[PDB]
């Protein structure tokens, strides 16, 4: 009655996969990469790597990977007007895969309001149902910019939080029922990530991105102790997220 | 009387109270034998303090014959954090020299995505325990009110949050005491544990977990005087909660 | 018309009795012990003697005592999940009375909500009516923990105070109409006892319990001048509330 | 006129005003003879300042022929504090050399458990005085508004508290002045007496009681200049309120 | 149309009279005494002369006086329970007039609520109409103690001010239509007189009373410059308000 | 146009504007001739600054032929302060060598007891002026908004106070400008004059009155720079407002 | 569809004209004078030149001027009761034009309420329609004094701002549809001009007027950098706004 | 999918994105070529920083064939500030050696007088673009939300202001992206730009304009680090926005 045995749940989790970020150290930080049946959130300031990571995953999710990962299709929801297919050209070149094939395997939609964003996710649930195992990654860049927009006054916050919680619980269910990785970007405020308890709870992994030495970037697990193991160095290139020169 | 028992009848009922070993002798002594039936035991602390290791360890130890005539039984696990991992149970089962698949078959598992969902799940749990009493010995809720923080984050709805929270916890008390099961729940901090008077009253035993020297952990009775007897040292391994190797 | 002569009231008060606490000095502090036709409130921190006193009275109320007190039955309402018949075994042993007889003379009920607690007290009024003089003591441990639980927000206090006042006025009437002692425990807050004017007015005697030297305890009349006569020393043993070594 | 008397008619009415001795000559001088009829006299102070001794002493002295042609009469005692004790009246009766049972037969007594109950009782008192005027000489309310504090403790209902309180006190004034009885009431402090403008206006005389040297007490006119004539020393004994033995 | 010529109004004002206070200097301060077609307000602390002045005017208003004043009857409204016909005996003795005659010419009523006080004033308007020129003085001791009583919370002030303004405008109309002096007493608060703008506007003359040397008193025009002409010394005796020894 | 005049038609209307001498040459120079028609002139100040003397003096000077072809006329006086005294007009008439009864016949007088009454009176004034234009030259309101302070003293009704006040003052402006009468009003201070923007806008000229050296007074244009031309010295005598005898 | 080509709009703007202020430097500051198809706002303290400028424009708007300006008629809305045709006599004399002709070309109306002011502007729109090109200037002295009057409390501001915005948008439309200059005066507050964003946006040019040396005045563009080019010196004479002696 | 495109289809759509030169090479480099289509570009700054010169310059440059295959097209200009001046376009057209009347015929222009009017105008714009796509290339809104400040200036209506503002800006985004037009808007500051999160999110590029040395101006990417590449120097001439002559 709404319950599985731990054995049945184990059978379900044996299908969990990781999508490489393109950086070895970053993957190790994540235990292999962006994990399915979970929401992974990346937040930071501008030029920390959020967009490069989103675009890189658009390519790596289509590639055969570790643990028998066969690759698959991607859904990209864009609230920021930042998706640029041309970036995928350089990234696909790096990974030696055809441009048009990469572009044919990414489905894309702009969201202009928070209500629209929620409608899109209902469409996404239907598409994942059409045939499971085809799509492996859902990207939302970004997760709640539109919720700040649509409920900006300090009197409408109750409805904002309710709508946000509803969307995120549906996003959790989507990730876990259909065995897809959900990657989302988020903004910061006076810094801390926005969304409060709701977004903190919904995300299974939260990554703070900041600038490193020169052109290097640093990824860290948010609210984790200040220790090196909880941090990873990566570089940004025309080929996407990658490893430092070394 | 209507709704009253004699102290003798109640004594007969309490003679069947049991404890489930935590895997640590010192922790068990602190608890008077382990996680106690006809009661709610709450464990709270920061990240990597032992909450998840204790939850998973209890999934195995609740199935083993133990002290005080404890015969072992089945477990129900409600997961609000997306943290349950059967593979941890395999390592802990190895430690206790018991079959993996048998351990996994004896744990019923459900994710909760909203506070309303969590309460519905607990109504199903009452039905399951009732189907045949004495089969299930442990109900785990990891965690008890993260979803109430989520669903009632803006103030002005706090009254309804407190009412729903109190209602769930009074039902939990009645479940633990009517069906003689131990209820183990985890909780977050904000440091002091969240939940205020409601959760403080509902729990019969409250445990703060914190990091000790090196890889050791420390369990303490919350709101108790600063004295050694109210504290216990334990260790965390791939085999679960255990004793320090001194 | 709702009035008695002072003579008739005197005839009524001539039946007032005291139930020994088990401690001579404590009894002297109370004028003989826990007094009938009145509410006596004991508050303090943990391990001050509240539970030991409740359990001790479960036995002493059944014993013949000073002033021709013949002993009688007890009703115990438990909001804290702290009643333990096993404690009564040691206390009965101390007073050389049979265990099963002691347990048969105590009626017991858990209250899980404040509304439930009030319903229980309405049942209690009916039971006392069935035959007066059978029951001599009503214990409520504790008096208003559940009222803090059920009305925790700062907007529901009006209804909380009204419900609390209603319960306590009925408790006063129960104690005085049926000539029973009412003993209740209470918590403290930033320390002072909770309940404010309502509980202060309802209780005829209020006792602060605190830790003394070593294992000794101290009982005092709350809000009374700082003088020795208003204080008493007692000890806690397996046999319940008792006198210090001396 | 309609509702008006000539000063002569009012003079004839006031010629029947009487005083009830407090048992203390100095206290009586302070009051102009004792507790005055056609008026409310309020006594307030801390614990063990004399309020209860004065209430009980008046239960006896109101029955004795006295100065100014006072013939003695019966007493009504409304008890909100659970403090009335006929046995005190026996000791005070002994002092004044009068029979116990006669003293007790001449005092009518009722407990009030709510403010609404207290007001209902006062309506019955008006009826009783009316049954045959000149029989009752004293109405005691110990205490006047503890129950109003209880029944309206949260703010927001303060308006209704003040309205009910004012209504009761205007009725009390009319009772004292229409039926030529002295009204004596006790009150708490919070230091200044509670009740604000309403109780200040309703009472014709207000007395603060405080502790003097050793076992002596001091009565003072409230809000009066710091001068000796506005103060009186009295003593408390088993025989009630009396004069200091200097 | 609701207007008189200044000539007709002059004819009306030619009938204005003064009632001596009993003190020569006090009368000079007032231009002859208490003036008709006007409200005169006296405020101060206790034992400043308010009651002595009220009682003195009860006698002097009946005496032939300066400017052809023939004397007349008085109406006394008592909100404070302070009117004492016996004081008039000594005052009448001073002025060598019969006691019973003085008492027969004063009509008296207690007011127990502010609504009652307003009803009484409506009765007074009717009585003055029965035959003008019979009554010369209306005393209200005090003017708004009952309005503070009936509207004590800070939420009912709107209705309080409206009722107070309505009463005072009717009082102005009574004084000016029927050519009677209206004398009222008032309390002070943190000192300043209570009533604010409403009472300040309604009163044509306002008098502050304070204690002078020894048993002397001082009357001053409130809010007037600090100069001797705006002040007068008077004495209080068994014969009422009078002149200093000198 | 509908509701518009040519500047020529308006010029013809303004050619009939007149001034009423204050009795003081220097005051008149300050005002450009005296109290001006088709305008409201407001005078405010403390007690005994000249407001009442000016009001009464104008009652006489408005009846005298004067400078600029002023022919004299009748006066309407609305009295909210109970300060109008025809006998003052007799002394002022003596100064100007005119008959008393003629002066008194030419002043129409009414008391206002409420703000609603004051507004009703002004509607009657509009009717009277209309009965035959050119008869009345001066409308005095002493004072303009004391009764609005009275009738709306508690906040929360301030909106209605401001609306009623604005409505009365716009009617006053229209009365002054439609019927070519001077409107003179007195006002209180709280220092700055009360009435805020509403009264500031409605008045065309505002005069502050204050005490000068010895028995002299000073009139000044409110809110004007500190310069001598904006000030005038005048004297007060039994004959009214006059010039200083230097 | 509600749009013009830039060419058609150019044809419309080619008819834009300027009305000289009477001061050469002031005109240069304005680019020729008061500009049509726009609102020009002048604010300042008293005696800064607002009224002199209004009256001067009443004459100069009728005079042939630079750029082929033929002169025309004027509408003057007066909320302050300050328009004086006699001033125009001296100004017309300066410009050598007949008095009666100047006065016949100015239409005039007083506004007594803000609603009235808005009704007047609706009449004005109709008059401008009767035949375009006849009227060249609309003066409003002042623009929103009556809006402060009619909405003075801090609770009615929403409706005030809405009404003010509505009037000003209609005023913009009037100026631009009928090719007329709109000149308005405004007050200042704690200094800054009143009206906030609404009036700031509606006005195309805003002029601060202040006192200069001796009798000279200074006009500046409000909120512009502190530089000489943004300022102009002018003089005030019986002939209106003019150039300094030099 | 329903509402989704493949990345390839979206790539084909973005291949038609164009840039409109600002007239300044350095400014263009800062913008990646100029004002970009399928996006909103916002420029804000103080007075005389270049906002109006840029708006007018774009009216001409949008009509010229340019880099990246830009063919030129028509412009829609919505004017909330009353600042559009075709004569400026004549000077700028001269600089670029193009006919005046042709330039003016290719700009459609409308004033907005209210925020509701502004939104209605944008609905007409959507219709016009749709009449035949590819004709219009640029929509200018000068300025974007001055009228929203005006129409919702009092707080309490801020919720509705934010909702209307968000709705307009989401429509603007959809207009820019559906019909492949560049949207250029100006904005005020209060220093930081007004509009909060809503306007920050809606604009894809935000430019702060400030004054440089002498007559130079500086354009910067808002909220970007203090670095030279994020800034550009340009000059303002009668010919519009141009490069500095160094």
């Amino acid at each position: 009655p709404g319950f599985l045995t731990a054995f049945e749940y184990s059978e379900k989790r044996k299908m969990v996969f990781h999508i490489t970020t393109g950086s070895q150290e970053f993957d190790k930080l994540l235990g292999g990469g962006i994990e399915s049946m979970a929401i992974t959130e990346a937040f930071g300031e501008f030029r920390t790597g959020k967009t490069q990571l989103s675009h890189t995953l658009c390519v790596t999710a289509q590639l055969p990977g570790a643990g028998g990962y066969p690759g698959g299709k991607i859904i990209f929801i864009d609230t920021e007007n930042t998706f640029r297919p041309d970036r995928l050209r350089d990234i696909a070149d790096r990974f030696n895969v055809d441009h048009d094939a990469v572009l044919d395997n990414v489905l894309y939609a702009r969201a202009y309001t928070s209500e629209h964003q929620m409608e899109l996710l209902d469409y996404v649930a239907a598409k994942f149902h059409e045939e499971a195992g085809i799509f492996k990654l859902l990207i939302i860049d970004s997760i709640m910019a539109l919720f700040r927009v649509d409920f900006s006054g300090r009197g409408e916050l109750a409805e904002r939080q309710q709508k946000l919680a509803q969307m995120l619980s549906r996003l959790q269910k989507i990730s876990e029922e259909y065995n897809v990785a959900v990657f989302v970007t988020n903004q910061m405020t006076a810094k801390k990530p926005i969304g409060g308890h709701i977004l903190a709870h919904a995300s299974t992994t939260r990554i703070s991105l900041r600038k490193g030495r020169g052109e290097l970037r640093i990824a860290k697990i948010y609210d984790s102790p200040e220790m090196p193991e909880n941090e990873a160095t990566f570089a940004i290139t025309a080929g996407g997220i990658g490893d430092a020169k070394e």
Side-chain angles (χ1 to χ4, degrees), chain A:
Chain A
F3 284 87
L4 305 176
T5 66
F7 177 94
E8 296 166 332
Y9 188 57
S10 181
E11 298 291 42
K12 188 175 177 185
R13 289 208 65 81
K14 285 180 180 182
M15 312 185 303
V16 166
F17 55 85
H18 294 82
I19 301 172
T20 180
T21 68
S23 159
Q24 294 180 12
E25 298 294 332
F26 205 160
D27 286 354
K28 298 193 190 305
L29 190 67
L30 295 170
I34 305 299
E35 192 180 8
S36 68
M37 293 186 66
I39 299 171
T40 301
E41 173 192 346
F43 57 87
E45 297 182 2
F46 193 65
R47 288 185 184 276
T48 58
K50 289 186 290 182
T51 297
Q52 283 289 348
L53 185 53
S54 298
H55 284 83
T56 299
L57 294 166
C58 283
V59 178
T60 56
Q62 310 188 25
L63 307 173
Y69 177 66
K73 297 193 178 183
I74 302 92
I75 298 190
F76 196 118
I77 298 178
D78 183 1
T79 73
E80 304 298 311
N81 200 23
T82 57
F83 182 63
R84 297 289 181 274
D86 284 358
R87 295 169 176 264
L88 306 190
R89 303 297 180 72
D90 302 297
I91 300 168
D93 286 340
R94 170 198 170 176
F95 291 105
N96 302 121
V97 288
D98 183 299
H99 304 170
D100 294 323
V102 164
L103 297 174
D104 289 326
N105 287 331
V106 177
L107 291 178
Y108 173 78
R110 287 274 284 122
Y112 301 98
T113 69
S114 60
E115 176 177 335
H116 188 199
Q117 177 178 339
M118 299 179 78
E119 292 174 352
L120 289 170
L121 288 173
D122 292 355
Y123 295 108
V124 166
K127 169 51 75 89
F128 289 175
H129 174 258
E130 285 181 22
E131 186 182 354
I134 300 298
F135 289 82
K136 301 291 178 185
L137 178 64
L138 169 62
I139 291 163
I140 305 172
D141 186 359
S142 70
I143 186 60
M144 65 174 291
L146 295 174
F147 286 81
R148 271 197 305 178
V149 167
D150 290 354
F151 310 88
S152 60
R154 271 292 178 178
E156 298 177 332
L157 179 54
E159 185 181 335
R160 190 197 100 172
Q161 298 299 68
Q162 197 155 6
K163 293 290 179 55
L164 184 66
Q166 173 179 343
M167 176 185 74
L168 286 168
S169 65
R170 281 181 172 187
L171 203 52
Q172 286 199 321
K173 294 178 197 158
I174 286 170
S175 76
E176 294 166 37
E177 172 66 16
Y178 301 111
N179 188 30
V180 300
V182 174
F183 175 75
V184 310
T185 65
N186 190 26
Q187 296 84 38
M188 306 187 71
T189 189
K191 283 189 179 188
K192 65 166 183 177
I194 64 180
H197 302 299
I198 303 176
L199 190 54
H201 164 275
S203 303
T204 297
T205 299
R206 308 188 81 192
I207 303 162
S208 179
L209 301 174
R210 69 185 195 271
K211 291 179 176 178
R213 288 299 192 194
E215 313 179 350
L216 296 177
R217 295 302 186 283
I218 297 162
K220 178 178 175 64
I221 294 72
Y222 176 62
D223 203 69
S224 65
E226 308 299 344
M227 298 177 180
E229 61 193 347
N230 294 329
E231 283 185 342
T233 301
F234 65 97
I236 291 167
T237 60
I241 297 292
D243 299 309
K245 301 181 184 177
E246 301 167 7

